[PDB]
Design a protein around this ligand. Structure first.
Ligand SMILES: NC(=[NH2+])NCCC[C@H](N)C(=O)O
Ligand SMILES: NC(=[NH2+])NCCC[C@H](N)C(=O)O
Ligand SMILES: NC(=[NH2+])NCCC[C@H](N)C(=O)O
Ligand SMILES: NC(=[NH2+])NCCC[C@H](N)C(=O)O
Ligand SMILES: [Cl-]
Ligand SMILES: [Cl-]
Ligand SMILES: [Cl-]
Ligand code: NA
Length: 129
């Protein structure tokens, strides 16, 4: 599923991401934009052999099992495929764990490089929320 901007904002809010760990909704929408272009099916292989999955590009190195990342963990206790669903529940639940891990949203390098310190409120501008 390819979400619309406001559509994803609403879904994220419904699943309790808005202001989660102190991060406003616009931060999460901005992260999703640059991670996946709002596409739930997005996958990207990393040079180390891990793969990033879904709307928030969650890494198999730590967070989900894909059966092909040697020495990795599965800290969200989920198959990485579950992170590709049209329903964002699994991705949101896992993202909550990731953002609570100590480094906040810096875990998402794209967030750090493209969203951090910017006018992230623009991402939810005009949305019926
Ligand atoms: N997201 C991470 N912390 N990735 C670490 C990369 C994998 C591992 N540290 C290696 O040298 O292959
Ligand atoms: N991005 C990371 N380095 N995450 C590691 C989290 C550590 C994890 N709770 C463990 O015991 O393995
Ligand atoms: N932690 C992140 N947000 N990484 C985003 C970089 C995306 C890129 N396609 C890659 O292979 O790395
Ligand atoms: N400042 C940005 N680059 N925002 C991205 C798009 C957000 C949206 N179109 C808005 O202004 O409400
Ligand atoms: Cl915001
Ligand atoms: Cl594995
Ligand atoms: Cl933080
Ligand atoms: Na894994």
């Amino acid at each position: 599923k390819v979400f619309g901007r406001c559509e994803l904002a609403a879904a994220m809010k419904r699943h309790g991401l808005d202001n989660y760990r102190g991060y406003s909704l616009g931060n999460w929408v901005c992260a999703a934009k640059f991670e996946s272009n709002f596409n739930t099916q997005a996958t990207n292989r990393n040079t180390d052999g891990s793969t990033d999955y879904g709307i928030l590009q969650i890494n198999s190195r730590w967070w989900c099992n894909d059966g092909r990342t040697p020495g990795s963990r599965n800290l969200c206790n989920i198959p990485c495929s579950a992170l590709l669903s049209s329903d964002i529940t699994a991705s949101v639940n896992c993202a909550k764990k990731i953002v609570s891990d100590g480094n906040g949203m810096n875990a998402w390098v794209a967030w750090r490089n493209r969203c951090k310190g910017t006018d992230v409120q623009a991402w939810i501008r005009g949305c019926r929320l």
